[PDB]
Amino acid sequence: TGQVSVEIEWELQKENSKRWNPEIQYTSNYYKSTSVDFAVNTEGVYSEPRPIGTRYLTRNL
Amino acid sequence: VGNSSGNWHCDSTWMGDRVITTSTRTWALPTYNNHLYKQISNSTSGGSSNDNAYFGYSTPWGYFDFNRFHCHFSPRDWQRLINNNWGFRPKRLSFKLFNIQVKEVTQNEGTKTIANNLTSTIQVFTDSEYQLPYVLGSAHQGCLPPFPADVFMIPQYGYLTLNNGSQAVGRSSFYCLEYFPSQMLRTGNNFQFTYTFEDVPFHSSYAHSQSLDRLMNPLIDQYLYYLSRTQTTGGTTNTQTLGFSQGGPNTMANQAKNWLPGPCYRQQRVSKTSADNNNSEYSWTGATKYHLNGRDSLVNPGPAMASHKDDEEKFFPQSGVLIFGKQGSEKTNVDIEKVMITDEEEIRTTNPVATEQYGSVSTNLQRGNRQAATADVNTQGVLPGMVWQDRDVYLQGPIWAKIPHTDGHFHPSPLMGGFGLKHPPPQILIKNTPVPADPPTTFNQSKLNSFITQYSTGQVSVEIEWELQKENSKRWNPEIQYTSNYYKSTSVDFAVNTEGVYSEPRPIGTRYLTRNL
Amino acid sequence: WALPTYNNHLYKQISNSTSGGSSNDNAYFGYSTPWGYFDFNRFHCHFSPRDWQRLINNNWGFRPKRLSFKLFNIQVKEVTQNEGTKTIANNLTSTIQVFTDSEYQLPYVLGSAHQGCLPPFPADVFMIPQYGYLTLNNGSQAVGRSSFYCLEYFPSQMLRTGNNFQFTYTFEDVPFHSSYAHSQ
Amino acid sequence: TGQVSVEIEWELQKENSKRWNPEIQYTSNYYKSTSVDFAVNTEGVYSEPRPIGTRYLTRNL
């Protein structure tokens, strides 16, 4: 056995949109939940609430 | 104030393999919604159609519309171009704007005096980052006057977003250019800027000297074989057999070729002769269309296609091509005589005909007890081995279009024809600056709604430097050309009747010169 | 923006006058001056919504350091109200004058969130709210120590049409307002 | 009358939190609404849907 790691250097095109109206975003809803999100239940098993997309920010066509 | 903001530079010149052009024209500027924004959906309506639902905003601003050709080339010159070169591509683009003036208007008792208010202003800008919804590529009327001496008003401006009937979604956006830097401008002060295109495939303005099925030699035969017999033919008896043969000059139809025709979309046919069409309203029902997000929309003009086959001058695709209207035409239900249709006989060379099947194929595998299956194909995608030519352009047509900034685009050649770009020329927008009326003597929380209604005007021009591949063909026989027929006509062509209205006789194509395939 | 005259270029005195009736709690004493001023002490006046958002979801704190100010394209209109028929033209030869108080000798008016801030929106237009201050008062009367100022006592870049005016200032050290919550 | 402007140059301390769980954010809800947010009704009057706070991102105490 043993441990390993991996490094990844990426590139990214930051947004330049001048849309005035506040776009949509990704967030954990603010209401109260018994079991947090992406947390680990009292047992230690780690689970995800929902799948996650990336097409969130709206850019002009 | 006492100095012109520049000279009227409007000419056409040819220095060789390049061509420069510019056209000066005089415009006008009206305010809108009294400098107020708006919201638009089934409101100032039509009633209920997920297909005719929209959502946008009318802004107090205006913009320029010159995405056509009859706006940069007088007819004759265009002609010059046609009969001598095979292809071209626009490289440079300049823009000048000057001689601004400001008028105000007091409508007292119907008596209105119009003088100038030399101290007012305006502001314009450009979008070199394309953050604003592109408006062109829609061929909206109000282009620079096809003519030079007339004058015009600048069409207001409005865009749209992702909508759901009469309601919008959360992701729907909303912009306001009042958020963009803009060279302010007062009378007497000028404004201009400049941009340059990027690499683009010269739109080939020529036809082909051969068709996809006649590219071989007539005096010889392929050294290959093909299936020519399924049964015996020697008397009065039928039995399973196999006769193979080569491809000869007399059986050219069967000879194995190497390439393949272009892509297609079947469409219903129609006639120019009223009585030969079925008697049923299928304009919207029997029409070719696609389905998207529930909203069913027509597919016009659709992909590149052929208008008709030989001698079918009576027909054309239901919604497969362009159409034009002689000057003086109105909005709806006008007849065929107030319009002009586009002939596409030039592509039968390589592309299929819209009102025609793409071809047939089989649906089963026969045996001595199973019959040979054969179906039809009216819908066709592309495969390795195809070649075609995009829709030809017309003088009274569009010039380029904005390629959607996406991850996937294929042979982005626009459908109306023209040129595409990942970074198209820009959009320039202007508006009259707001100037409030007499405000109250005390304070009032609310903003203002009372202003002096006014308008402004002036002249502008644009320079375009292009590229062109002159012909090298050694065809011996005299090709065809474009010319005004030599007989006598009461009203000249591209002239102006005794009234001054300027109209075009017919639409104009470019695929005139025939170059070898 | 736009600019209206006031009290026909005249000063005033104000206490339980153009009133309410009797309240040592609603007693005041001030002066309405023919002058006007600027009101932009808010945020929806410098940040469109979206952008503000951008700011929020990425940074913890911030502090404004630099501040510039430009002002131009002035025009002058006059008004003749004859028989209800009023022609509005311009009088390009008239003028105005503005100044600034870098010594803070004038009663500060902001910090009161008075309406009339720059339009939260950019395309609309607005009038500039008149200006008036107050002093130490005693009901409907003032005290001896009450003061009385007149800016007509201050230098002011005069200004005629076509001529521009601008100036500049820079903040000083301030604790970045922490825009975040706590995890415990 | 006339036009004016103002320039403001600020400073900002970008976040360094290594919270693993996805924090909360500010966004216009994704459902469908007749009148957009921070838009202008068919009349041109511009109005705001709700007031806006800044204490959104959670940093450790």
Side-chain angles (χ1 to χ4, degrees):
Chain A
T1 68
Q3 321 76 64
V4 300
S5 68
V6 295
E7 300 194 306
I8 323 178
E9 299 188 359
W10 325 54
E11 207 76 3
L12 35 165
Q13 306 175 61
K14 34 63 171 187
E15 177 268 62
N16 229 184
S17 170
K18 294 296 136 285
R19 134 108 128 303
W20 167 296
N21 151 64
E23 45 277 284
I24 65 84
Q25 297 276 57
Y26 177 63
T27 183
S28 318
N29 286 70
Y30 33 96
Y31 58 57
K32 39 175 178 170
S33 189
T34 163
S35 187
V36 195
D37 306 356
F38 301 90
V40 257
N41 67 319
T42 170
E43 225 42 64
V45 187
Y46 173 53
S47 58
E48 303 71 6
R50 67 203 82 178
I52 301 181
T54 89
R55 308 285 183 60
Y56 276 29
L57 198 160
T58 290
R59 166 245 255 293
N60 193 299
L61 180 166
Chain B
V1 186
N3 45 302
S4 64
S5 216
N7 30 55
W8 183 305
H9 228 297
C10 160
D11 65 64
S12 59
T13 171
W14 282 294
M15 54 165 94
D17 57 354
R18 296 265 227 60
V19 53
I20 306 73
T21 181
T22 174
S23 302
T24 302
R25 281 177 165 48
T26 314
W27 50 264
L29 209 295
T31 76
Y32 292 83
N33 335 305
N34 307 52
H35 324 307
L36 290 179
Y37 282 65
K38 302 288 191 65
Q39 169 174 297
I40 314 78
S41 61
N42 299 60
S43 299
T44 58
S45 60
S48 297
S49 303
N50 292 304
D51 51 66
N52 242 185
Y54 56 149
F55 203 136
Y57 303 74
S58 171
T59 167
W61 295 72
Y63 64 109
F64 285 59
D65 163 10
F66 55 136
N67 182 294
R68 274 208 273 183
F69 285 59
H70 64 187
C71 20
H72 313 264
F73 299 56
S74 171
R76 129 77 193 183
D77 38 298
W78 167 290
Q79 146 167 53
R80 163 100 108 170
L81 168 56
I82 318 311
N83 301 313
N84 302 294
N85 308 294
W86 293 350
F88 58 72
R89 121 195 177 207
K91 274 212 296 75
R92 276 281 305 293
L93 167 53
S94 301
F95 184 125
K96 275 183 172 62
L97 176 156
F98 43 35
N99 307 190
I100 301 61
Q101 310 169 54
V102 174
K103 272 61 180 61
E104 50 64 65
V105 68
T106 57
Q107 213 82 186
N108 293 302
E109 318 164 296
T111 303
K112 41 77 236 61
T113 297
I114 307 76
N116 60 299
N117 174 63
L118 60 172
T119 52
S120 178
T121 57
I122 54 173
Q123 61 291 289
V124 70
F125 72 116
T126 71
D127 184 359
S128 297
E129 30 289 304
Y130 318 72
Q131 302 157 179
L132 297 200
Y134 210 97
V135 66
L136 293 73
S138 297
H140 294 313
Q141 37 216 61
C143 84
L144 305 179
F147 193 77
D150 262 301
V151 307
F152 64 141
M153 59 176 213
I154 285 60
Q156 183 188 61
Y157 167 51
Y159 61 173
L160 325 78
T161 49
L162 324 177
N163 86 313
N164 181 301
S166 309
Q167 300 182 171
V169 187
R171 294 179 301 183
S172 296
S173 60
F174 175 70
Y175 309 58
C176 289
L177 53 169
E178 11 306 334
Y179 201 48
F180 293 121
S182 297
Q183 295 260 326
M184 194 102 48
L185 196 32
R186 178 184 290 280
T187 172
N189 203 179
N190 91 309
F191 156 61
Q192 42 78 296
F193 95 106
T194 297
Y195 149 84
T196 171
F197 291 106
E198 55 68 76
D199 174 64
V200 62
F202 300 86
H203 164 311
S204 66
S205 309
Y206 54 68
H208 273 52
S209 314
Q210 306 112 282
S211 297
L212 263 291
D213 53 308
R214 315 304 172 189
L215 344 73
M216 356 66 86
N217 176 296
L219 279 285
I220 324 306
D221 325 291
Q222 306 180 173
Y223 52 100
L224 298 60
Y225 294 90
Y226 74 117
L227 158 53
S228 52
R229 276 201 175 312
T230 317
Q231 304 176 290
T232 244
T233 300
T236 58
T237 58
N238 313 313
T239 58
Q240 330 297 315
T241 191
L242 307 180
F244 280 107
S245 48
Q246 312 193 67
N250 26 60
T251 61
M252 300 184 259
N254 312 284
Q255 302 176 186
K257 304 168 179 53
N258 176 74
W259 314 59
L260 206 62
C264 84
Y265 229 52
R266 197 75 111 78
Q267 287 204 174
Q268 183 63 186
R269 190 169 71 177
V270 56
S271 179
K272 302 179 180 180
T273 306
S274 309
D276 284 58
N277 315 308
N278 193 203
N279 188 61
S280 301
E281 280 286 6
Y282 50 37
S283 64
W284 178 244
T285 293
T288 58
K289 50 190 176 186
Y290 65 62
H291 192 167
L292 176 279
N293 189 62
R295 359 173 68 180
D296 242 359
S297 195
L298 197 158
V299 298
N300 194 115
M305 220 64 263
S307 179
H308 50 54
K309 57 182 184 182
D310 65 299
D311 331 310
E312 290 299 304
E313 300 316 305
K314 309 181 299 179
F315 317 65
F316 62 90
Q318 168 180 48
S319 306
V321 291
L322 314 166
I323 318 76
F324 289 115
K326 314 191 210 302
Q327 190 58 47
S329 303
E330 49 186 357
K331 257 205 61 54
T332 43
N333 279 182
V334 202
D335 192 72
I336 183 180
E337 304 167 1
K338 308 290 166 46
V339 308
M340 289 186 267
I341 310 177
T342 57
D343 200 289
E344 286 309 73
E345 189 76 292
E346 305 59 48
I347 323 310
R348 63 182 181 173
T349 54
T350 62
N351 305 50
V353 192
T355 59
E356 294 285 7
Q357 53 184 55
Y358 182 94
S360 60
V361 287
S362 299
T363 68
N364 210 295
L365 16 157
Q366 48 55 73
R367 287 106 69 178
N369 58 296
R370 173 62 76 280
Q371 247 298 295
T374 302
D376 195 9
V377 188
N378 23 51
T379 162
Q380 181 56 305
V382 60
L383 321 74
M386 290 161 58
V387 53
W388 61 91
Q389 298 187 296
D390 54 8
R391 193 68 62 66
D392 168 57
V393 305
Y394 289 87
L395 172 161
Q396 300 135 296
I399 169 126
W400 72 76
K402 167 61 142 54
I403 305 179
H405 207 152
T406 75
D407 48 46
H409 43 58
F410 164 61
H411 225 67
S413 304
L415 286 170
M416 317 172 97
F419 307 150
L421 322 71
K422 288 211 72 177
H423 295 318
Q427 309 182 308
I428 52 293
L429 297 68
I430 188 69
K431 88 166 175 185
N432 287 182
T433 302
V435 169
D438 181 302
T441 302
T442 308
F443 186 84
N444 173 54
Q445 185 269 306
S446 187
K447 27 90 286 187
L448 283 294
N449 53 314
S450 63
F451 337 97
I452 303 74
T453 308
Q454 53 196 49
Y455 68 59
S456 295
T457 68
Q459 321 76 64
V460 300
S461 68
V462 295
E463 300 194 306
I464 323 178
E465 299 188 359
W466 325 54
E467 207 76 3
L468 35 165
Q469 306 175 61
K470 34 63 171 187
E471 177 268 62
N472 229 184
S473 170
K474 294 296 136 285
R475 134 108 128 303
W476 167 296
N477 151 64
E479 45 277 284
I480 65 84
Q481 297 277 57
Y482 177 63
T483 183
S484 318
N485 286 70
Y486 33 96
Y487 58 57
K488 39 175 178 170
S489 189
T490 163
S491 187
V492 195
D493 306 356
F494 301 90
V496 257
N497 67 319
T498 170
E499 225 42 64
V501 187
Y502 173 53
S503 58
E504 303 71 6
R506 67 203 82 178
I508 301 181
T510 89
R511 308 285 183 60
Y512 276 29
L513 198 160
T514 290
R515 166 245 255 293
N516 193 299
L517 180 166
Chain C
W1 50 264
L3 209 295
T5 76
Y6 292 83
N7 335 305
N8 307 52
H9 324 307
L10 290 179
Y11 282 65
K12 302 288 191 65
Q13 169 174 297
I14 314 78
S15 61
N16 299 60
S17 299
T18 58
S19 60
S22 297
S23 303
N24 292 304
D25 51 66
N26 242 185
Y28 56 149
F29 203 136
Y31 303 74
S32 171
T33 167
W35 295 72
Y37 64 109
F38 285 59
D39 163 10
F40 55 136
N41 182 294
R42 274 208 273 183
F43 285 59
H44 64 187
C45 20
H46 313 264
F47 299 56
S48 171
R50 129 77 193 183
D51 38 298
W52 167 290
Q53 146 167 53
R54 163 100 108 170
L55 168 56
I56 318 311
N57 301 313
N58 302 294
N59 308 294
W60 293 350
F62 58 73
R63 121 195 177 207
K65 274 212 296 75
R66 276 281 305 293
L67 167 53
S68 301
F69 184 125
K70 275 183 172 62
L71 176 156
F72 43 35
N73 307 190
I74 301 61
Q75 310 169 54
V76 174
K77 272 61 180 61
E78 50 64 65
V79 68
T80 57
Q81 213 82 186
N82 293 302
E83 318 164 296
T85 303
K86 41 77 236 61
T87 297
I88 307 76
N90 60 299
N91 174 63
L92 60 172
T93 52
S94 178
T95 57
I96 54 173
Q97 61 291 289
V98 70
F99 72 116
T100 71
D101 184 359
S102 297
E103 30 289 304
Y104 318 72
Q105 302 157 179
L106 297 200
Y108 210 97
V109 66
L110 293 73
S112 297
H114 294 313
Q115 37 216 61
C117 84
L118 305 179
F121 193 77
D124 262 301
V125 307
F126 64 141
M127 59 176 213
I128 285 60
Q130 183 188 61
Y131 167 51
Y133 61 173
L134 325 78
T135 49
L136 324 177
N137 86 313
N138 181 301
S140 309
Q141 300 182 171
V143 187
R145 294 179 301 183
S146 296
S147 60
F148 175 70
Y149 309 58
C150 289
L151 53 169
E152 11 306 334
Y153 201 48
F154 293 121
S156 297
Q157 295 260 326
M158 194 102 48
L159 196 32
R160 178 184 290 280
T161 172
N163 203 179
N164 91 309
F165 156 61
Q166 42 78 296
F167 95 106
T168 297
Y169 149 84
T170 171
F171 291 106
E172 55 68 76
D173 174 64
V174 62
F176 300 86
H177 164 311
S178 66
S179 309
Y180 54 68
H182 273 52
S183 314
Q184 306 112 282
Chain D
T1 68
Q3 321 76 64
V4 300
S5 68
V6 295
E7 300 194 306
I8 323 178
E9 299 188 359
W10 325 54
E11 207 76 3
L12 35 165
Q13 306 175 61
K14 34 63 171 187
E15 177 268 62
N16 229 184
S17 170
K18 294 296 136 285
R19 134 108 128 303
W20 167 296
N21 151 64
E23 45 277 284
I24 65 84
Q25 297 276 57
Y26 177 63
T27 183
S28 318
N29 286 70
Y30 33 96
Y31 58 57
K32 39 175 178 170
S33 189
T34 163
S35 187
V36 195
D37 306 356
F38 301 90
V40 257
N41 67 319
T42 170
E43 225 42 64
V45 187
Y46 173 53
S47 58
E48 303 71 6
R50 67 203 82 178
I52 301 181
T54 89
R55 308 285 183 60
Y56 276 29
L57 198 160
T58 290
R59 166 245 255 293
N60 193 299
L61 180 166

